[PDB]
Ligand binder design. Sequence first.
Ligand SMILES: Cc1cc2nc3c(=O)[nH]c(=O)nc-3n(C[C@H](O)[C@H](O)[C@H](O)COP(=O)(O)OP(=O)(O)OC[C@H]3O[C@@H](n4cnc5c(N)ncnc54)[C@H](O)[C@@H]3O)c2cc1C
Ligand SMILES: Cc1cc2nc3c(=O)[nH]c(=O)nc-3n(C[C@H](O)[C@H](O)[C@H](O)COP(=O)(O)OP(=O)(O)OC[C@H]3O[C@@H](n4cnc5c(N)ncnc54)[C@H](O)[C@@H]3O)c2cc1C
Ligand SMILES: Nc1ccnc2ccccc12
Ligand SMILES: Nc1ccnc2ccccc12
Lengths: 429, 439
Amino acid sequence: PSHVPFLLIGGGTAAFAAARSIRARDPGARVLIVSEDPELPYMRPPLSKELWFSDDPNVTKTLRFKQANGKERSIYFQPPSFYVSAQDLPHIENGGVAVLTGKKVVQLDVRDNMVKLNDGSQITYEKCLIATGGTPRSLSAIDRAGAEVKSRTTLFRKIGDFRSLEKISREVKSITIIGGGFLGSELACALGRKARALGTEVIQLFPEKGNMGKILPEYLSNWTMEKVRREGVKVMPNAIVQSVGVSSGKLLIKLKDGRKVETDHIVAAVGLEPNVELAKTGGLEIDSDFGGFRVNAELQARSNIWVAGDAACFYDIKLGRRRVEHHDHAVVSGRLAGENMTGAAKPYWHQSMFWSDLGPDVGYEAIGLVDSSLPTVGVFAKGVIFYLRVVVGIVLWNIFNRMPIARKIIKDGEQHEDLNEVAKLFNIH
Amino acid sequence: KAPSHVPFLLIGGGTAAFAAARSIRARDPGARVLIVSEDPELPYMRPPLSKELWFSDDPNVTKTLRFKQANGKERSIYFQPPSFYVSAQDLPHIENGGVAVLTGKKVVQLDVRDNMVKLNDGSQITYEKCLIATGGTPRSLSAIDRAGAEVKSRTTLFRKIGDFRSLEKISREVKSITIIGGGFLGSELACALGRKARALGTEVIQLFPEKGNMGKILPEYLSNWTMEKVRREGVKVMPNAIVQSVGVSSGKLLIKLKDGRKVETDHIVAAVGLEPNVELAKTGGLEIDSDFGGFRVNAELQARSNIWVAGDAACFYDIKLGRRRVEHHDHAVVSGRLAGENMTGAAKPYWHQSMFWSDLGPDVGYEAIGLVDSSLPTVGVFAYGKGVIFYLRDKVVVGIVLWNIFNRMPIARKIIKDGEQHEDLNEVAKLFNIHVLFQ
Ligand SMILES: Cc1cc2nc3c(=O)[nH]c(=O)nc-3n(C[C@H](O)[C@H](O)[C@H](O)COP(=O)(O)OP(=O)(O)OC[C@H]3O[C@@H](n4cnc5c(N)ncnc54)[C@H](O)[C@@H]3O)c2cc1C
Ligand SMILES: Cc1cc2nc3c(=O)[nH]c(=O)nc-3n(C[C@H](O)[C@H](O)[C@H](O)COP(=O)(O)OP(=O)(O)OC[C@H]3O[C@@H](n4cnc5c(N)ncnc54)[C@H](O)[C@@H]3O)c2cc1C
Ligand SMILES: Nc1ccnc2ccccc12
Ligand SMILES: Nc1ccnc2ccccc12
């Protein structure tokens, strides 16, 4: 279309949450999502968890999974029928939400409230959301290596990466994951389960002393490393890749400490870069400290431009400036951006949580500023870890259905005299 | 006195606030604008307080607060006479609204959620659109803070009309005044007191830690040249001076410098920078900028949905020059005018760069625009009686200083805007009628 009232750039979690939010407050709204991916809006978390533990061998085609509640669900937020076509968006009665797949916004003219797509077409808007997310980072060693190495290295992010790596796990005998964070540790447990039935190998190396060394205290990270290892993974901590090359057709990873790792495929899970290409042409400020588009407490960048999701560096009136890369944050902030695009003028207030599952025996939820650099106070019986600066972050270890309590402790900002007494709020005695 | 609700609420009664009120009224005929000013004066301009009012031929200038401009026409220091304003009590009723000023009242609390403010007297005012134009407070030296009350009683922080009247009376009473600070304010007051001191035979000292006046603004060779011009105005300039302590010796102030020198004087004027007034950020939940200070606002000077910031207290995003905060008179006008337009739906970014100027006597006057910083690499082209100094970043001119060259600011504004990578800056100097120095 040549003009649309609401234009959401990017077709991910934040964009979909905004469309549902705009339509809820403006029942007649006409929302156009522009997505460079060929897929309709889908959620990522199942790509590294539930889709790898499915009993259906057609999961690669169906993209369905059983949730914690047991009910089966699709990875997509809505079926295609719930959307309208971009051709009909300006005419359909009571508007709707359209998605323009396979199209990338390459230029943003803030002055004329216009965008230019990769195919030359131009679209003007009245309100606009930037929800571009981010691109996976790559290691300098894989960049400085040959093309044979880059071709045998996976950057896990999209549905295509899940299908590509699932096929690889059924073809080669050894996969090495580089990265000890959420993505690396979850993929290790997933490939470990698959590797147990085939007798194959799954290696995970990272520079920290343990899994989630940057998130969890050392004692809990070390326990996590054992949980991952018991899933069939060969975990190699304190590993800094110096170089990577192909030797006799086999990948050879040379670590700075003299160790060498022979493997068939590499998976790089070493962080995320916010997609801020459009800041240049748009004259939009980016944040030098946290990266991403710099927006205020209401996720607003300019008069008619908001930013949500992984790419949004926002001002938390209580926690300070920050940028979050969590699924529930894209939902909360995407929903908030949609409301503010319809006049709500509301600041980011309801904190978003994140979670991770490392096998069937390890699952935790977290909220707020969770950083191993902050001083921690862990209370275990299952347990809870408090992060301090007043409680600013909480990690619930195998404790579920208690997130509102954690969200309330951080909100109230009390100076607790005994956190062991606070642990009773999570049923720890 | 103050109404319970006003459409437009401007916090602070200075240059940015007045420029916004005039801008709001020009774009929104009939608008109702309430300025809240803790000062007792109606909005007035500051530059004359350190310049034209000290060179006036009228001996009643201290009372009239009028001065002759460069064009020669006489005018008052106030932006408008009282007749231009309406009273806050009548602001909600007068036909086609107006602009009211609530003097002697300070906004002490800001509730962004409820679009409400609380004044120091407990009264509460709700608004639809709000401008924070609080400016800044002069800084004080730690040596003057650690000194006795006798020292604090004879040390002036120059900012308001009261400080001009207080220091003008002092210049006619004591024999030695010492200015601490080598920037614009210190150097302009030194030239002013120097003129007065020549007719009275008194003394004017100016000490600062830099090697010369405006050492942070001008290259070293031009700062040194300026220091000599200031000295020839009757000033005893002491560069490379770091105040260690201050005390009273035989009833006279005694300034002990870290390098062993001592200065005996009767009165001190501290011109050592400005602190943005960001008191209201706490209650308002408004972000302040850790690098440049002030309220952090975007290219449209906006902080939240219905709150803008302009003037000295506004750290904004310059789409061309990057994030910064400016403390210039013309910037308060430009940014105040820009905030006013955006408070009426304009949604316009800071684009037209503001200029600043300074006069150091009758034989030294310069204009400047953009990022003027002595730390940046400079390229000066002179004919130092006349010339232009270019400030560079990424092989591009980001700031210009016109030295005794006037009526050519639009040309400087265009060079910075176009962002060309000039091969020969001497050819660019011809655009300023100059027919070469690196620092
Ligand atoms: C495998 C995986 C597992 C995860 N598991 C969890 C989990 O268990 N718990 C958790 O809390 N979080 C998890 N996350 C993180 C969560 O998925 C992210 O926080 C979330 O996807 C962020 O949504 P977003 O809307 O900001 O961006 P995205 O989901 O990245 O969507 C952005 C979309 O915009 C498109 N785009 C970018 N630039 C342009 C442009 N110029 N024009 C058009 N389109 C453009 C991108 O292609 C992408 O399609 C996981 C992420 C991954 C990849
Ligand atoms: C003596 C002097 C000479 C100058 N000469 C020049 C010059 O030649 N060229 C140049 O470019 N610049 C010059 N400047 C700088 C220029 O004056 C400033 O940039 C300008 O005054 C800034 O305007 P402003 O509106 O941001 O703030 P201000 O003029 O400082 O106005 C702020 C007002 O708000 C009031 N206020 C603050 N907080 C509150 C509150 N909570 N509630 C109510 N009221 C409040 C303050 O009391 C003050 O009255 C000079 C400054 C001075 C002091
Ligand atoms: N489990 C997760 C939590 C937060 N961010 C993530 C990013 C990528 C993969 C997994 C996660
Ligand atoms: N001439 C000036 C320019 C900018 N700031 C100033 C502050 C005080 C005095 C004079 C000036």
